[PDB]
Amino acid sequence: FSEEQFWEACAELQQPALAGADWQLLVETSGISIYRLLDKKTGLYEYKVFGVLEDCSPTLLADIYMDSDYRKQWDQYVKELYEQECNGETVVYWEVKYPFPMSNRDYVYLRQRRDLDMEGRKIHVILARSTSMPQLGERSGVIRVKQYKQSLAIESDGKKGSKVFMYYFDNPGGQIPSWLINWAAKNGVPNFLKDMARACQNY
Numbered sequence: 001f002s003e004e005q006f007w008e009a010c011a012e013l014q015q016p017a018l019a020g021a022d023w024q025l026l027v028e029t030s031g032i033s034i035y036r037l038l039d040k041k042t043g044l045y046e047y048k049v050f051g052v053l054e055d056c057s058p059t060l061l062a063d064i065y066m067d068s069d070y071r072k073q074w075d076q077y078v079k080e081l082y083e084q085e086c087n088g089e090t091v092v093y094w095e096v097k098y099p100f101p102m103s104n105r106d107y108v109y110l111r112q113r114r115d116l117d118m119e120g121r122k123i124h125v126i127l128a129r130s131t132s133m134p135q136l137g138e139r140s141g142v143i144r145v146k147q148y149k150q151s152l153a154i155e156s157d158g159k160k161g162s163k164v165f166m167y168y169f170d171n172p173g174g175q176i177p178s179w180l181i182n183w184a185a186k187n188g189v190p191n192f193l194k195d196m197a198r199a200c201q202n203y
């Protein structure tokens with residue numbers, strides 16, 4: 001991750017650039033919308049998120065976005081989660097819970113956060129990139145996501161909460177049933193955002 005990247009994540013934050021291609025809404029909650037672009041050739045999706053979470057100190061949200069020990073402790077969908085230093089960077093191992101029948105999914109990736117000073121504004125930016133390691137091979141039963149990348153940008157909304165922007169894409173290793181998206185959309189996330197807020201107030 002360079003300088004380049006971190007600032008790039010901030011842009012759409014300032015301005016949602018969706019005009020480009022066939023984006024589409026999907027959901028709006030707690031002051032947050034989720035757009036998605038479907039790559040017609042691969043069937044893969046590309047998500048984009050904006051919104052405002054009042055009651056979330058831009059500073060907390062970020063801390064909490066890096067705190068595994070705690071995250072592990074409150075995020076109902078986290079089966080396993082841990083960090084290790086590899087060379088000079090921090091590699092994350094995360095195992096996500098999928099409804100049985102579906103295999104859970106697990107990620108190995110390089111994560112990194114930097115708090116930017118653009119215009120005397122503290123913009124907490126974090127980047128994620130899948131990566132690999134000899135000693136941490138794929139697991140049986142669990143589907144290893146080898147293509148995955150995400151960036152999240154946080155900032156004060158001026159009031160009590162925060163204004164944010166997020167990019168996400170990963171290749172899940174299998175077909176994601178539209179009912180799962182519907183759940184995700186209609187219940188999953190809403191509640192997640194909820195449980196999370198609760199999680200900031202109780203930090």
Ligand SMILES: CCCCC/C=C\C/C=C\CCCCCCCC(=O)OC[C@H](COP(=O)([O-])OCC[N+](C)(C)C)OC(=O)CCCCCCC/C=C\C/C=C\CCCCC
Nearest residue numbers: 026027034047077094096107164168181184185188189192
């Ligand atoms: C509303 C429309 C729904 C769109 C469909 C989404 C997912 C469908 C695919 C699988 C769903 C199976 C169930 C999983 C539980 C979902 C509950 C949830 O929603 O669990 C929050 C979590 C965000 O993971 P993470 O970013 O905390 O780190 C993630 C690190 N690893 C990528 C390694 C995990 O979901 C995940 O991973 C799952 C990947 C989806 C990411 C794209 C949508 C973003 C959704 C929520 C986050 C939005 C706002 C808050 C985030 C911070 C705000 C500053």
